[PDB]
From a paper:
Whereas the most dramatic substitutions of four asparagine residues to aspartate resulted in an insoluble protein, a double mutant (N328D and N420D) was identified that exhibited reduced glycosylation and increased solubility. The solvent accessible surface area on domain III buried by the panitumumab Fab is 840 Å2 and the total solvent accessible surface buried at the panitumumab:domain III interface is 1664 Å2. The heavy chain CDRs account for the majority of the buried surface area (63%) with most of the specific hydrogen bond interactions at the panitumumab:domain III interface being made by CDRs H2 and H3. The CDRs except H3 pack against their corresponding Fab chain. This CDR arrangement, along with the configuration of the side chains in the beta sheet portion of the CDRs creates a central cavity located between the heavy and light chain. Interestingly, this cavity is not filled by EGFR when bound to EGFRD3 ND2 and the conformation of the Fab is not altered significantly upon binding to the EGFR (unpublished panitumumab Fab structure). A single water mediated interaction by the H3 CDR is visible in the central cavity of the EGFRD3 ND2 Fab complex. The water mediates an interaction between Ser468 on the EGFR and Asp100 in the H3 CDR. However, as seen with the Ser468 in the EGFRD3 ND2, water mediated interactions can also provide charge tolerance, particularly for smaller side chains. The L3 CDR lines up adjacent to the final β-strand of domain III and makes main-chain to main-chain interactions between the carbonyl oxygens of F91 and D92 and the NH of S468 of domain III. Y35 of H2 hydrogen bonds with S440 and S418 of domain III and H3 residues Y54 and Y55 which hydrogen bonds to N384 of domain III.
Residue numbers in the entry:
A (entry chain I): 1 to 213
B (entry chain J): 1 to 133, 141 to 191, 198 to 218
C (entry chain M): 312 to 502
Amino acid sequence: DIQMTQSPSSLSASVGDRVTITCQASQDISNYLNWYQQKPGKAPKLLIYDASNLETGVPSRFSGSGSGTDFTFTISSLQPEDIATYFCQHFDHLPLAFGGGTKVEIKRTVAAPSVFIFPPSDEQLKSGTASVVCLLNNFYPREAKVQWKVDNALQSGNSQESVTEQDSKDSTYSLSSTLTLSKADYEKHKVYACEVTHQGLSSPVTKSFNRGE
Amino acid sequence: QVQLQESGPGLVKPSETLSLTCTVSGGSVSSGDYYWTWIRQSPGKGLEWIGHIYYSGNTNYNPSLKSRLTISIDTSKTQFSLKLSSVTAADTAIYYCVRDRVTGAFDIWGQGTMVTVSSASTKGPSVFPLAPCTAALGCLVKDYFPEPVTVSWNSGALTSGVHTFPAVLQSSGLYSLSSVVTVPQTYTCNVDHKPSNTKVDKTVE
Amino acid sequence: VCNGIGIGEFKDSLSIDATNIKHFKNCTSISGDLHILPVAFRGDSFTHTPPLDPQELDILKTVKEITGFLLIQAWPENRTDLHAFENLEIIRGRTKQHGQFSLAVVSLDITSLGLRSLKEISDGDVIISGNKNLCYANTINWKKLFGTSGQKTKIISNRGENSCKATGQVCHALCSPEGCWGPEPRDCVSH
C-alpha cells in the first residue's frame, strides 16, 4: 500500500521556463519510479522509466531524478505542446499505483475572445425546446464571464458552459454557453443577446440577434 | 510497431459483469517479456492499476478489485480480456489495456474506452445546425446517453479551426455537446454515437 | 559436463521439456543457458509432450555451475521454493538474456528462493518480478554474489515487505543482516 504524492497539483509557466515537479513515496521504492504524460483527450505516454532513463522518442528537454522516497521530474524548456497532466508510478511491489497527477499549463499574452451567437434551428423548435448557443473562441486567460439577456432581462439558472482544454499550439481556450428555453417561452420574446467580459476586452462585448429575422 | 485496441460495451447495468477485450496488433501476446495489464481512470480515483496476466497463466489482481476480477489471455487471436462482476457506479471509468514490460514500465497503451455503469437506457442523439442569423458555424449534438460521441468535419478533411467542446450533463440525465468551426464550400459534421449505432452527416448552411 | 538449452543436445529445444530432462542426471556443470518456460508444465500440444512431473525436478540438485544465464518463467504449483537448485553455486553469465540478465525469476507462486548454495554470480543483472508469494528476496545482500562492478538487482512487482513479516516469514535471529533464502536457520548466508 504505497502512497504516491505529487506536488504541485497544478502550475502555470511561460514558454521556455524550467518546470520542476516532485513525486514523493510513502516508503523507499529505490529507483522503481516512472513518469507518464497524458495530453488532453489521449492516453498516458511513458517518458521516464527507472526514475532517470529517457524513453526513446521523447524530447531531450524532459528528465527525471531521484531514488528512495523523493523524486523530481524536470522540463528544461517548456513548450506549448507540453500542456498535459504528468503522473508518477511506482513498481516496487504489488499492487502498482500512480500519483495524483500534476497539471501543467502555459502562460501567454492576453488574447480577446471572438464572440458568435447561434439562434435555435427550426428543426429543434418542432421538438418543443429551444437552445441558444454563444461561442467564445481562442482567448487567454481562461477566466471569462458570459451573461445571457432576453429582452434586456438577465438570465441565470438556465444556461451551461463548456470550455476546451488549453490549445497545444497558441495556448488559448474556447468556451461555449448554451441557453435552454422552451418553445412557448422562446416565442414570447424577441431580442436574444450574449454579453461577454474578458481581460482582453476594454469594454464588455455583446453579440445579439432578433428572433425570426 | 505494436498497437493495442479496446473493445466492449460502453454501458453496463449495475450488479452485472463488465467485459472488455484488447486485441494486440503487430505483435504476439506470447512473449515472456511483458505483463498484459488493464488500467482504468476516473474522476475521484485517478489512474488505478487493475491487474495483469502473464503468458504462463499467472495473474496478479489489485486487492481493491480482487473479489470481482478475472483476467484471461487468448494467444490464438492475440487477445486478452477483462471481466469485472457486480459493478456499481464506482466502476464508471475509462479503461485502458496496457503492455507492462517485466522491466517495469507501461510502455504501450491502448486508446482507452469509456465504460458507464447506469440503469438508464441508451438514447441516440439529435443533431441540430449552428448557423448565424471571420464567420463560424457548427453542430449541436443534444440529448444522448451514454458517452461518448465522435464529431468530425468533412470526414476528417477539415481539421483547422475545429473546436469540439467537452460534453455537458443536462438536468435530464442526458449528455449534450457542440462542435464549431471558424471559416474565413459545403460543411458537414459527422456525428457518431456508437452505443446507439447512430451516424449522422449534418450539412450546415 | 553437459550443455545448456540451445547448445548441442538441445539444438531445437526452447526450454527443459519432458524429452530432454533425462540428459541432466549426474551433471555438475552446464555449458550454456537454462530455460524454464511455461511449456514445461502446461505441456506441448503439438509434440504431445506431457507436463514434467514436479517430483522430477530433483534431477538438477547435482548442478553446481552454469556458464550462461538461468531463466525461470515457470515452476510447479506444488513446490513452494526452488530447492531443486539447492546445490547451484556459480552462474558465470558470459551469455545473457537480451545481454543484461543472468538470473530471472518471473511470475512464480514460490514462497522462497531457496538458492542456499548460490555464492557467486560472476556477471549480469538479476531481475525478480511478478512473484506474488515470494519472500526473503529483498533481504538478500546481492553484493556478495556479484563480481562485476555495476551488477543491478530488480526486485519489483512482488509480494510486499510487510506481507512477509505478517506471516512471520523473515530470517532467523541466528544470522547476519545479509538476508536468507528461507525461514530456516540453514538458509542464512552468513553468521
